[PDB]
Amino acid sequence: VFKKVLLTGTSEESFTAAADDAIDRAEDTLDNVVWAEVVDQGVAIGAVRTYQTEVQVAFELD
Amino acid sequence: VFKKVLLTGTSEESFTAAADDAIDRAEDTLDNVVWAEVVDQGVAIGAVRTYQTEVQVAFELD
Amino acid sequence: VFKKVLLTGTSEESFTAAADDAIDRAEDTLDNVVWAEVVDQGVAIGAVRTYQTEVQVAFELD
Amino acid sequence: VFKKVLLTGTSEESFTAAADDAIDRAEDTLDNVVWAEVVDQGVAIGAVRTYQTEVQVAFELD
Amino acid sequence: VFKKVLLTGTSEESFTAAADDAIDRAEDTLDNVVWAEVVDQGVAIGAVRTYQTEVQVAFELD
Amino acid sequence: VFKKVLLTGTSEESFTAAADDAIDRAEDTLDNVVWAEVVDQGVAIGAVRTYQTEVQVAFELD
Amino acid sequence: VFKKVLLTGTSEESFTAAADDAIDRAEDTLDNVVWAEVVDQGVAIGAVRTYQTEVQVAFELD
Amino acid sequence: VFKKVLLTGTSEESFTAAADDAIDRAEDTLDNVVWAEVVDQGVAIGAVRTYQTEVQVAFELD
Amino acid sequence: VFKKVLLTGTSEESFTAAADDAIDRAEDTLDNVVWAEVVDQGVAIGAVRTYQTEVQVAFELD
Amino acid sequence: VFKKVLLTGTSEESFTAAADDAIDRAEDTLDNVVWAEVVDQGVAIGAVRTYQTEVQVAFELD
Amino acid sequence: VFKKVLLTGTSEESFTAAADDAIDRAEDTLDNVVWAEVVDQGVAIGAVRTYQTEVQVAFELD
Amino acid sequence: VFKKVLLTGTSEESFTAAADDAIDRAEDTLDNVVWAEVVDQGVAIGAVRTYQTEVQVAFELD
Ligand SMILES: Cc1cc2nc3c(=O)[nH]c(=O)nc-3n(CCNC(=O)OC[C@H]3O[C@@H](n4cnc5c(=O)[nH]c(N)nc54)C[C@@H]3O)c2cc1C
Ligand SMILES: Cc1cc2nc3c(=O)[nH]c(=O)nc-3n(CCNC(=O)OC[C@H]3O[C@@H](n4cnc5c(=O)[nH]c(N)nc54)C[C@@H]3O)c2cc1C
Ligand SMILES: Cc1cc2nc3c(=O)[nH]c(=O)nc-3n(CCNC(=O)OC[C@H]3O[C@@H](n4cnc5c(=O)[nH]c(N)nc54)C[C@@H]3O)c2cc1C
Ligand SMILES: Cc1cc2nc3c(=O)[nH]c(=O)nc-3n(CCNC(=O)OC[C@H]3O[C@@H](n4cnc5c(=O)[nH]c(N)nc54)C[C@@H]3O)c2cc1C
Ligand SMILES: Cc1cc2nc3c(=O)[nH]c(=O)nc-3n(CCNC(=O)OC[C@H]3O[C@@H](n4cnc5c(=O)[nH]c(N)nc54)C[C@@H]3O)c2cc1C
Ligand SMILES: Cc1cc2nc3c(=O)[nH]c(=O)nc-3n(CCNC(=O)OC[C@H]3O[C@@H](n4cnc5c(=O)[nH]c(N)nc54)C[C@@H]3O)c2cc1C
Ligand SMILES: Cc1cc2nc3c(=O)[nH]c(=O)nc-3n(CCNC(=O)OC[C@H]3O[C@@H](n4cnc5c(=O)[nH]c(N)nc54)C[C@@H]3O)c2cc1C
Ligand SMILES: Cc1cc2nc3c(=O)[nH]c(=O)nc-3n(CCNC(=O)OC[C@H]3O[C@@H](n4cnc5c(=O)[nH]c(N)nc54)C[C@@H]3O)c2cc1C
Ligand SMILES: Cc1cc2nc3c(=O)[nH]c(=O)nc-3n(CCNC(=O)OC[C@H]3O[C@@H](n4cnc5c(=O)[nH]c(N)nc54)C[C@@H]3O)c2cc1C
Ligand SMILES: Cc1cc2nc3c(=O)[nH]c(=O)nc-3n(CCNC(=O)OC[C@H]3O[C@@H](n4cnc5c(=O)[nH]c(N)nc54)C[C@@H]3O)c2cc1C
Ligand SMILES: Cc1cc2nc3c(=O)[nH]c(=O)nc-3n(CCNC(=O)OC[C@H]3O[C@@H](n4cnc5c(=O)[nH]c(N)nc54)C[C@@H]3O)c2cc1C
Ligand SMILES: Cc1cc2nc3c(=O)[nH]c(=O)nc-3n(CCNC(=O)OC[C@H]3O[C@@H](n4cnc5c(=O)[nH]c(N)nc54)C[C@@H]3O)c2cc1C
Ligand SMILES: [Cl-]
Ligand SMILES: [Cl-]
Ligand SMILES: [Cl-]
Ligand SMILES: [Cl-]
Ligand SMILES: [Mg+2]
Ligand SMILES: [Mg+2]
Ligand SMILES: [Mg+2]
Ligand SMILES: [Mg+2]
Ligand SMILES: [Mg+2]
Ligand SMILES: [Mg+2]
Ligand SMILES: [Mg+2]
Ligand SMILES: [Mg+2]
Ligand SMILES: [Mg+2]
Ligand SMILES: [Mg+2]
Ligand SMILES: [Mg+2]
Ligand SMILES: [Mg+2]
Ligand SMILES: [Mg+2]
Ligand SMILES: [Mg+2]
Ligand SMILES: [Mg+2]
Ligand SMILES: [Mg+2]
Ligand SMILES: [Mg+2]
Ligand SMILES: [Mg+2]
Ligand SMILES: [Mg+2]
Ligand SMILES: [Mg+2]
Ligand SMILES: [Mg+2]
Ligand SMILES: [Mg+2]
Ligand SMILES: [Mg+2]
Ligand SMILES: [Mg+2]
Ligand code: NA
Ligand code: NA
Ligand code: NA
Ligand code: NA
Numbered sequence: 106v107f108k109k110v111l112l113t114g115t116s117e118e119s120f121t122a123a124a125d126d127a128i129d130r131a132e133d134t135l136d137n138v139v140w141a142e143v144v145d146q147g148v149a150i151g152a153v154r155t156y157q158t159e160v161q162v163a164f165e166l167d
Numbered sequence: 168v169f170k171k172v173l174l175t176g177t178s179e180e181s182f183t184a185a186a187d188d189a190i191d192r193a194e195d196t197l198d199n200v201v202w203a204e205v206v207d208q209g210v211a212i213g214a215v216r217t218y219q220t221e222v223q224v225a226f227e228l229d
Numbered sequence: 230v231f232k233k234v235l236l237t238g239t240s241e242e243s244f245t246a247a248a249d250d251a252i253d254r255a256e257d258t259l260d261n262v263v264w265a266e267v268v269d270q271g272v273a274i275g276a277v278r279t280y281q282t283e284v285q286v287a288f289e290l291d
Numbered sequence: 292v293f294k295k296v297l298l299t300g301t302s303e304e305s306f307t308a309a310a311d312d313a314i315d316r317a318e319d320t321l322d323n324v325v326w327a328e329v330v331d332q333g334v335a336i337g338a339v340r341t342y343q344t345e346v347q348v349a350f351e352l353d
Numbered sequence: 354v355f356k357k358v359l360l361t362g363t364s365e366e367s368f369t370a371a372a373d374d375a376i377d378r379a380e381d382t383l384d385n386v387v388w389a390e391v392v393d394q395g396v397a398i399g400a401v402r403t404y405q406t407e408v409q410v411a412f413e414l415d
Numbered sequence: 416v417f418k419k420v421l422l423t424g425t426s427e428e429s430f431t432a433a434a435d436d437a438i439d440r441a442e443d444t445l446d447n448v449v450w451a452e453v454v455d456q457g458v459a460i461g462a463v464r465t466y467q468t469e470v471q472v473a474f475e476l477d
Numbered sequence: 478v479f480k481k482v483l484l485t486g487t488s489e490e491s492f493t494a495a496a497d498d499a500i501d502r503a504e505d506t507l508d509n510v511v512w513a514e515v516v517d518q519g520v521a522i523g524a525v526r527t528y529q530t531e532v533q534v535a536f537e538l539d
Numbered sequence: 540v541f542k543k544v545l546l547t548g549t550s551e552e553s554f555t556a557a558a559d560d561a562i563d564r565a566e567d568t569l570d571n572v573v574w575a576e577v578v579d580q581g582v583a584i585g586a587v588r589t590y591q592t593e594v595q596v597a598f599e600l601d
Numbered sequence: 602v603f604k605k606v607l608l609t610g611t612s613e614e615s616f617t618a619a620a621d622d623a624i625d626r627a628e629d630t631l632d633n634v635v636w637a638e639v640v641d642q643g644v645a646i647g648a649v650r651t652y653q654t655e656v657q658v659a660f661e662l663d
Numbered sequence: 664v665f666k667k668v669l670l671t672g673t674s675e676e677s678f679t680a681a682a683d684d685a686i687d688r689a690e691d692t693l694d695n696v697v698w699a700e701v702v703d704q705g706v707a708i709g710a711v712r713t714y715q716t717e718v719q720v721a722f723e724l725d
Numbered sequence: 726v727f728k729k730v731l732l733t734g735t736s737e738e739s740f741t742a743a744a745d746d747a748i749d750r751a752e753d754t755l756d757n758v759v760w761a762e763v764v765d766q767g768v769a770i771g772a773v774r775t776y777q778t779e780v781q782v783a784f785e786l787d
Numbered sequence: 788v789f790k791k792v793l794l795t796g797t798s799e800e801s802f803t804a805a806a807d808d809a810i811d812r813a814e815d816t817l818d819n820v821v822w823a824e825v826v827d828q829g830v831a832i833g834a835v836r837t838y839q840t841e842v843q844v845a846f847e848l849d
Binding site for chain 2: 304307331332334335336340342
Binding site: 242243244245258269270271272274278280 | 292303305306307311318324325326327328329346
């Protein structure tokens with residue numbers, strides 16, 4: 106059985122790096138992280154632009 | 168990084184109050200709740216009508 | 230077996246009241262109405278504003 | 292011909308009031324506003340909760 | 354309040370059995386599991402075919 | 416001209432059998448039933464699991 | 478309150494004529510038909526091509 | 540950079556002519572109109588039927 | 602077994618004629634073409650307008 | 664690089680068997696078939712019922 | 726109240742840079758640009774490849 | 788007439804590079820490749836992360 110958590114990563118560099126940011130966090134807390142599916146992307150436009158990528162991160166249970 | 172949980176709130180009053188019910192629960196257990204996105208709405212039609220609003224509730228990790 | 234009818238309720242007060250308007254009509258004509266799922270919402274903007282909520286209203290057959 | 296603008300209204304009271312907030316703004320600047328279609332709803336969760344409703348607001352050209 | 358977890362069950366037999374696999378896991382760890390909504394289905398095609406069914410599994414909080 | 420009715424069939428066995436349950440009901444009351452399109456699937460999780468499959472069932476008018 | 482029926486019209490001429498075919502049928506049986514929304518279009522490719530347009534046809538109840 | 544405006548054209552003749560009606564209006568007011576994407580179609584059913592086609596009309600900025 | 606190819610037909614006349622253009626091409630190269638489903642429509646706006654209709658064209662294998 | 668073909672399998676038994684029918688055909692003609700994603704399901708309702716499952720079948724190129 | 730404009734940015738480098746191109750244009754003409762949501766991505770494949778990213782760019786009114 | 792093939796490109800660097808990988812393959816085998824539309828993005832999370840971008844790649848027939 107796989108479980109997915111819905112995480113939004115952030116980066117001041119790119120959408121790819123923002124996806125990586127979410128995956129990094131998943132891997133810090135979860136075992137057996139296997140894949141991620143991009144579900145949304147955006148940009149927070151402030152003093153700087155922060156790229157965001159929302160991902161379902163799938164991990165194998167047990 | 169943000170994480171979202173998928174909660175369905177309920178109210179005998181309104182769709183807004185049902186969204187609030189879910190957010191109330193999120194805030195009881197989670198720190199740094201920042202926003203909610205409505206993803207579904209409905210009504211359980213019994214002795215009384217119960218309005219339901221399903222929300223992704225986003226919170227900041229750490 | 231459940232059957233759904235696609236009804237648009239109207240209210241000069243709120244989206245919740247507009248959903249109720251549709252459900253009210255369903256319950257006037259149908260037996261065993263059990264739930265409603267919101268599928269669209271809008272506002273007719275005239276002399277007054279009329280809130281509309283479109284619902285699939287599910288009822289149990291037999 | 293109709294044209295639509297994509298507006299997000301806000302209210303500390305309800306999703307209906309947030310839709311109204313967007314429509315109010317449309318009517319301040321545009322002639323012949325005829326209808327609005329809800330396209331998203333959410334809640335900014337801060338010191339207070341701010342309900343938001345995003346609407347396509349349609350107006351007749353000329 | 355209901356909460357949903359997003360689980361992908363697997364079976365070498367059928368899409369129904371794969372949905373059951375996810376629900377089985379939910380019921381092992383969670384109290385008050387009430388329903389599941391199918392959100393995706395697929396097949397891993399290897400030495401054998403493994404049917405997968407992704408479900409939102411809803412449970413009542415408290 | 417074809418008309419569709421939106422029916423949710425149920426089965427304690429499978430998603431296919433649940434689709435059949437809806438079609439069975441359609442054929443009991445309607446003439447010239449020609450096809451069904453699956454639009455949703457789920458499982459009611461109680462004393463037993465009840466698989467549900469929602470179908471648009473198309474029939475030829477006249 | 479409005480109600481919608483889901484009809485597929487057919488024409489050997491055009492998608493517009495196929496929409497009209499569905500509306501024609503609605504108006505033959507129903508009072509207060511007010512609008513139709515196109516939800517699908519296709520073509521049956523046989524001895525001749527038959528254009529099909531599926532519409533939700535809305536009518537005012539009472 | 541391209542910008543899109545969301546216009547609903549109308550015609551008593553056809554969905555194609557309704558798309559053209561929107562594009563005609565775009566070209567009256569905007570420079571460098573390049574393409575249109577159909578996003579919705581419907582029919583206002585009154586004394587006469589009025590076909591409507593909603594289009595995103597894209598134009599090149601500058 | 603059916604297979605679908607994703608084709609975009611073009612016409613300077615209408616969306617229906619553009620669908621036909623795609624189907625014409627399918628029938629030139631493929632045996633047992635049975636149906637087409639419209640998946641997108643648009644207009645290339647140049648010296649002339651070119652209507653486009655994208656279709657999944659289904660054909661029976663073998 | 665992966666490529667997907669869009670196939671509709673058929674079975675007089677089940678949606679799972681219909682998915683298998685499509686995959687069987689893919690594997691007869693293609694090398695390195697790796698997965699399938701269900702994209703639609705339905706039932707042809709004639710002398711017998713024929714379950715259909717449409718799948719994107721992914722295979723590795725080279 | 727927020728308003729969104731639908732812009733397609735372009736870059737010969739990346740999807741992120743294409744999103745930035747749209748945002749750059751928004752900020753040249755509009756005050757109080759706050760966020761952007763990615764709604765489509767593609768690539769024009771000519772003498773060179775031009776990455777495109779379509780964004781809803783939100784700005785605060787007044 | 789345009790035809791689209793559904794390809795998933797891969798890269799250990801970025802989503803843009805993964806889109807390019809698919810387009811590269813298309814251009815190796817097909818004439819008159821004109822555009823690509825991104826339809827999905829994800830990441831295979833193993834010894835290394837492999838970014839994937841699924842694209843419809845459109846080419847002109849003849
Ligand atoms: C993908 C995406 C979707 C969103 N959706 C919403 C929304 O639906 N409603 C909303 O209020 N804010 C959103 N936001 C806004 C979160 N805020 C944000 O991005 O702010 C960027 C900068 O602008 C400043 N800022 C925040 N709120 C406001 C504001 O209301 N007005 C102005 N002028 N500036 C503002 C603070 C930051 O330096 C979204 C941000 C992203 C990246
Ligand atoms: C948004 C939404 C989606 C749903 N979707 C489903 C579904 O897909 N399948 C399903 O079985 N029940 C659903 N439900 C039903 C959950 N039950 C429910 O709302 O019941 C309302 C009242 O009706 C009674 N009830 C429950 N099940 C039945 C039933 O089967 N028949 C009758 N006559 N009444 C029933 C108990 C409550 O007093 C949904 C409820 C809501 C609010
Ligand atoms: C959710 C939603 C979707 C819609 N979609 C369409 C549409 O696609 N095409 C369309 O013609 N009208 C629509 N309508 C319009 C139905 N008419 C409507 O709301 O009118 C409100 C007031 O404006 C007046 N009105 C109606 N049509 C016209 C018009 O064409 N121009 C002007 N200036 N006003 C008009 C009569 C009412 O007092 C929609 C209304 C709602 C609430
Ligand atoms: C519908 C909707 C979609 C959104 N989507 C995004 C998004 O995609 N990315 C994003 O960064 N912020 C969003 N936002 C956030 C806009 N900010 C926001 O709602 O903040 C509410 C309160 O929380 C505070 N806040 C803002 N950003 C943060 C934050 O990052 N962490 C914490 N702890 N608090 C924060 C300021 C306000 O008092 C969305 C808000 C709404 C209402
Ligand atoms: C619903 C669904 C969506 C997917 N989506 C992706 C995807 O987007 N990207 C991806 O790389 N793999 C996917 N997969 C692939 C997961 N792998 C998988 O199913 O492998 C089946 C058998 O094929 C073998 N395999 C795995 N990767 C490859 C591969 O790259 N090439 C070949 N020839 N075989 C492979 C191992 C297994 O025995 C998906 C599997 C399923 C069931
Ligand atoms: C596809 C699908 C969508 C749904 N969506 C909703 C919904 O949106 N809101 C809702 O209240 N119930 C739903 N339901 C719930 C209908 N009820 C249901 O499935 O109950 C299964 C068993 O659990 C018991 N049950 C019902 N409601 C409750 C509950 O609230 N808590 C607990 N612990 N158990 C409950 C009675 C049955 O023996 C859905 C059921 C299905 C199959
Ligand atoms: C929009 C749309 C969606 C569809 N979806 C399906 C589907 O999902 N499954 C399916 O079996 N048939 C479909 N059909 C097929 C309905 N049949 C049909 O269009 O047939 C056209 C001509 O081809 C002949 N035909 C029917 N079935 C067959 C077949 O299986 N093979 C061949 N070679 N020809 C056939 C009879 C007619 O003269 C669809 C038709 C349309 C117009
Ligand atoms: C695509 C589309 C979506 C829509 N969606 C809505 C909606 O969501 N809510 C709504 O109130 N009206 C709509 N409309 C209605 C706009 N009105 C409309 O089409 O009216 C046609 C004729 O019927 C008459 N009409 C208008 N409103 C009524 C009405 O309420 N009842 C009756 N019997 N007739 C009416 C005036 C015109 O001669 C839509 C029209 C179109 C073409
Ligand atoms: C449904 C649809 C979706 C599209 N999507 C895109 C897109 O996402 N990105 C893009 O660059 N072009 C598109 N196109 C543009 C393809 N080009 C096109 O339609 O051009 C029409 C006339 O305008 C001229 N043209 C082409 N590119 C340009 C341009 O960039 N600027 C100007 N002023 N004119 C142009 C040549 C033709 O005579 C789309 C065309 C259609 C019909
Ligand atoms: C998922 C799905 C989507 C479809 N969509 C369409 C459609 O959009 N338009 C259409 O014409 N037929 C469809 N079809 C119809 C393909 N035909 C079909 O299923 O026929 C079943 C039995 O009924 C008989 N049949 C075929 N067409 C007719 C018909 O028009 N009327 C009657 N009474 N029976 C008919 C022959 C078979 O024994 C679809 C079939 C399936 C399984
Ligand atoms: C996301 C996206 C969606 C689109 N959708 C459409 C469409 O729906 N219909 C369409 O005609 N063109 C599109 N386009 C095409 C816009 N044209 C384009 O990208 O052209 C790229 C290069 O190919 C050349 N080119 C343009 N049109 C044609 C063509 O018809 N054939 C050939 N062989 N080459 C062509 C000129 C450029 O150097 C789309 C481009 C993008 C980036
Ligand atoms: C976008 C996308 C969608 C997918 N969807 C599915 C799916 O629906 N079902 C599925 O089984 N695998 C998928 N996959 C999985 C394909 N496998 C994959 O990415 O594996 C990455 C690394 O993890 C290892 N791995 C593969 N399967 C398993 C596994 O089951 N458990 C563990 N712990 N590790 C695994 C091999 C690779 O080094 C998807 C991969 C991508 C990139
Ligand atoms: Cl989720
Ligand atoms: Cl828009
Ligand atoms: Cl319906
Ligand atoms: Cl496809
Ligand atoms: Mg930096
Ligand atoms: Mg988002
Ligand atoms: Mg009360
Ligand atoms: Mg729901
Ligand atoms: Mg009042
Ligand atoms: Mg509507
Ligand atoms: Mg207050
Ligand atoms: Mg939003
Ligand atoms: Mg076995
Ligand atoms: Mg999936
Ligand atoms: Mg049993
Ligand atoms: Mg459902
Ligand atoms: Mg003729
Ligand atoms: Mg259809
Ligand atoms: Mg005329
Ligand atoms: Mg519309
Ligand atoms: Mg001509
Ligand atoms: Mg397109
Ligand atoms: Mg049998
Ligand atoms: Mg289908
Ligand atoms: Mg360069
Ligand atoms: Mg696009
Ligand atoms: Mg590297
Ligand atoms: Mg995918
Ligand atoms: Na989730
Ligand atoms: Na219906
Ligand atoms: Na817009
Ligand atoms: Na395809």
